[PDB]
Design a protein around this nucleic acid. Structure first.
Ligand SMILES: [Mn+2]
Ligand SMILES: [Mn+2]
Ligand SMILES: [Mn+2]
Ligand SMILES: [Mn+2]
Ligand SMILES: [Mn+2]
Ligand SMILES: [Mn+2]
Ligand code: NA
Length: 327
DNA sequence: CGGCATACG
DNA sequence: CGTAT
DNA sequence: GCCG
């Protein structure tokens, strides 16, 4: 009834088991803060299974036969169904370790390994980090300075204005080049932490050298608060606001049109969806998938794709629109 | 038990 | 090390 | 933590 891989089932943005999935995702996040990628993955997958169910789970027996539910995830759900709360989840929520690793890793430029080291050094607050700025990278200094704005959700309204701005600079850098909205907003989210754009050009090869030209023009318009040949740019944009402005994270990515379907697929996510899709491709089909292409290692050939639909067909999967990739 | 996605900056 | 989905 |  329920396939094992998230890429084999539709997952809508909103669903019927929100509280249960959020609890399991707390445990997934905490596992990640402790370097347990395997446990993170299982809890993520179990959470996603519930997102894909057609109705609420009300009794423990409804978990029987569901992939990725074993003793641990089942007990989490059991406690939530019986008591409305899971003691393990609540203990994580209020732990100093969890709250601080969450606070630190949310900083642009800070990963788990950096946050862990800072935690072991006794640091606990953002002001603790501001006191010793000589230990910060330029990227972390930017992430810390802009942290408050970057913690404010980006609205769909913000996205349209940013897209117009990016297209203006893209059109000057290379007439005919296109801008596609990707990431969470393409999956139908109404808010997000950042905005993701994919840029290409209909004439293979014309996109070479494009991203530096785009960035130079955005920077000349005074719109870049922070950025690093290249094909991915992780920026902080100055977004106009009523009588002011706010910092917003924007990712710009360039791909040649031959690779565009693969890059669109990868950059549209979700993160779990893409990991599961790549896992499925390799383990079930013997094909190697990334945001550049799909490789047959036996024939030593790349699949040509003209669309996302092509890629799902190549992999023997029913097509899923972006709004059903919210694994 | 081994595996857990796969890149770029 | 960071970043991305 | 769970699957095959
Ligand atoms: Mn009980
Ligand atoms: Mn995004
Ligand atoms: Mn992004
Ligand atoms: Mn490339
Ligand atoms: Mn093992
Ligand atoms: Mn993201
Ligand atoms: Na971070």
């Amino acid at each position: 009834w329920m396939p094992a891989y998230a890429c084999q089932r539709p997952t809508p943005l909103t669903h019927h088991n929100t509280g249960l999935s959020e609890a399991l995702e707390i445990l997934a996040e905490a596992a990640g803060f402790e370097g347990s990628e395997g446990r993170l993955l299982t809890f993520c997958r179990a959470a996603s299974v519930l997102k894909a169910l057609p109705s609420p789970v009300t009794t423990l027996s409804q978990l029987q036969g569901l992939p990725h539910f074993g003793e641990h995830s089942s007990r989490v759900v059991q406690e939530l169904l019986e008591h409305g709360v899971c003691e393990e989840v609540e203990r994580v929520r209020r732990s100093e370790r969890y709250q601080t690793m969450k606070l630190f890793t949310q900083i642009f430029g800070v990963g788990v390994k950096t946050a862990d080291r800072w935690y072991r050094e006794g640091l606990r607050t953002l002001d603790d980090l501001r006191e010793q700025p000589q230990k910060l990278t330029q990227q972390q200094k930017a992430g810390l300075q802009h942290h408050q704005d970057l913690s404010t959700p980006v609205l769909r309204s913000d996205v349209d204005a940013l897209q117009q701005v990016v297209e203006e600079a893209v059109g000057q850098a290379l007439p005919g080049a296109t801008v596609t909205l990707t990431g969470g907003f393409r999956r139908g989210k109404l808010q997000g932490h950042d905005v993701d754009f994919l840029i290409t050009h209909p004439k293979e090869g014309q996109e070479a050298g494009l991203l530096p030209r785009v960035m130079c023009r955005l920077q000349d318009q005074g719109l870049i608060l922070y950025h690093q040949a290249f094909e991915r740019s992780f920026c902080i944009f100055r977004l106009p606001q009523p009588g002011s402005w706010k910092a917003v994270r924007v990712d710009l990515v360039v791909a040649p049109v031959s690779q565009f379907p693969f890059a669109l697929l990868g950059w549209t996510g979700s993160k779990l969806f893409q990991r599961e899709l790549r896992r499925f491709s390799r383990k079930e089909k013997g094909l190697w998938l990334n945001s550049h292409g799909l490789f047959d290692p036996e024939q030593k050939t790349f699949f040509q794709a003209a669309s996302e639909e092509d890629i799902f067909r190549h992999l023997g999967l029913e097509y899923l629109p972006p709004e059903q990739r919210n694994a």
